Amino acid sequence: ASGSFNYGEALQKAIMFYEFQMSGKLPNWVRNNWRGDSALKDGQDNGLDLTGGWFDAGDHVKFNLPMSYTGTMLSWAVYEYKDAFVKSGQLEHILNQIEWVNDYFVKCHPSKYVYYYQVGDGSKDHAWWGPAEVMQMERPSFKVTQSSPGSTVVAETAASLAAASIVLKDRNPTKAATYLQHAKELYEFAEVTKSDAGYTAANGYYNSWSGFYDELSWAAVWLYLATNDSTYLTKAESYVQNWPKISGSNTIDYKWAHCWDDVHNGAALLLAKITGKDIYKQIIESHLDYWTTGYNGERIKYTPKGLAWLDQWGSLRYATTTAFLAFVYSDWVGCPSTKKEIYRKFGESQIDYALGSAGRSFVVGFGTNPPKRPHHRTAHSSWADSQSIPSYHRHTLYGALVGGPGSDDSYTDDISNYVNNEVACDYNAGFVGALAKMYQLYGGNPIPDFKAIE
Numbered sequence: 001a002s003g004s005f006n007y008g009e010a011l012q013k014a015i016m017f018y019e020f021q022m023s024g025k026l027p028n029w030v031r032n033n034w035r036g037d038s039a040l041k042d043g044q045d046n047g048l049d050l051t052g053g054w055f056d057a058g059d060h061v062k063f064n065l066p067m068s069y070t071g072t073m074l075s076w077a078v079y080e081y082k083d084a085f086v087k088s089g090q091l092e093h094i095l096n097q098i099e100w101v102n103d104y105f106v107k108c109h110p111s112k113y114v115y116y117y118q119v120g121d122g123s124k125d126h127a128w129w130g131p132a133e134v135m136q137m138e139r140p141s142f143k144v145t146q147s148s149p150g151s152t153v154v155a156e157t158a159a160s161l162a163a164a165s166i167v168l169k170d171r172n173p174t175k176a177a178t179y180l181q182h183a184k185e186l187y188e189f190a191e192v193t194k195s196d197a198g199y200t201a202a203n204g205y206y207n208s209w210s211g212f213y214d215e216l217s218w219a220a221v222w223l224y225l226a227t228n229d230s231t232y233l234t235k236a237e238s239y240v241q242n243w244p245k246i247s248g249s250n251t252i253d254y255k256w257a258h259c260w261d262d263v264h265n266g267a268a269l270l271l272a273k274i275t276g277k278d279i280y281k282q283i284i285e286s287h288l289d290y291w292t293t294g295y296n297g298e299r300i301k302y303t304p305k306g307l308a309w310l311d312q313w314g315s316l317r318y319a320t321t322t323a324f325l326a327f328v329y330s331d332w333v334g335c336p337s338t339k340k341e342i343y344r345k346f347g348e349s350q351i352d353y354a355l356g357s358a359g360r361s362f363v364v365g366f367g368t369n370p371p372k373r374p375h376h377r378t379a380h381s382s383w384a385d386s387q388s389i390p391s392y393h394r395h396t397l398y399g400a401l402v403g404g405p406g407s408d409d410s411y412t413d414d415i416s417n418y419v420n421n422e423v424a425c426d427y428n429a430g431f432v433g434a435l436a437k438m439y440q441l442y443g444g445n446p447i448p449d450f451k452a453i454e
């Protein structure tokens, strides 16, 4: 313990958050005693068991694009920082969550070119305010096929399964082999179709804004790492030419973040490590330089108290993800010496901001004056279809990273504020990797055997 915060406790809780998002029939390894079985008929409108996975955010839709992004990110965290997970006693918990979500993706893949990408209707799900276990509305399931395709979600799902096949191989080699086979199939599905025309049920929520070429590289990278089949490296490298551009230009867009929609920056980082090529160093360093000291004379906005601030919706999600990339690249022997220090320092600053360096934690159930009214149906647990009843949440959503402050560091803590005070799978994903690095560096002991029991 050498750092400003208890990073082990923070890591432990940030992993635990995913328990609270669990959908379906809860297995005996679940630690908490306040979530119960939910959404048990998921899939039955299409003759399948599609139970499992995670509810996305403060809602109960299963949106497989951010869900699969999260899956990949959690495996990437283990792939980079396994020894931090082992030392903190957190490996078994993150592997449990990685197995959980990827088991749901396997369920969603019932024929080679049939992939279910959503369970729940956004409008019906969001119109009701109550806990998961007592939902009564219809929860339709949605699929892409060869004639009605979804390359972006399929490819991101391939990535998740390929990454899981690596990190779960020691514990469950049989399941790992199953994941890899589904990953390879889903990748072929994404490649043969090259289209999102059938990916419609997430519209207004998780549209594919950047297109699927970033996912085609990212999934091929993971599949190369899982297989050592050089064809996947060829494809990953190839698809770089179609990565998202600054509009009107031929320059890859470095001014956003690695996120559920756009995974090119993480793909670049891993391609720099795999191949050593300058092309990829140039990509990832433009991005990381823009976030830190500047690139070609422009830098991201910073709040007065030191948050790198991309957007008002999920600012902490973006900063904390970029923190994880900064750590992974600065840990690499190929990073320029000086940028190592700049990038690590940046990552520290952003995690410490999340954890409370500005005077207040943004992590539910952690630190000083954390959020107490996150925009989350199940944590709140209304019996009256009302955000105001009860006045206080009946359950603590330990570990949940909220959306974050305004550009002036301000924040309130309102149940109704889904911009600054929602919580989500993708918000915690890169955060968990970054917290593992901080624990590696600075320690802080997890609460021993901590379980969220009421």
Ligand SMILES: [Ca+2]
Pocket (backbone or CB within 6 Å): 152, 208, 209, 210, 211, 212, 213, 214, 215, 261, 262, 263
């Ligand atoms: Ca994309």
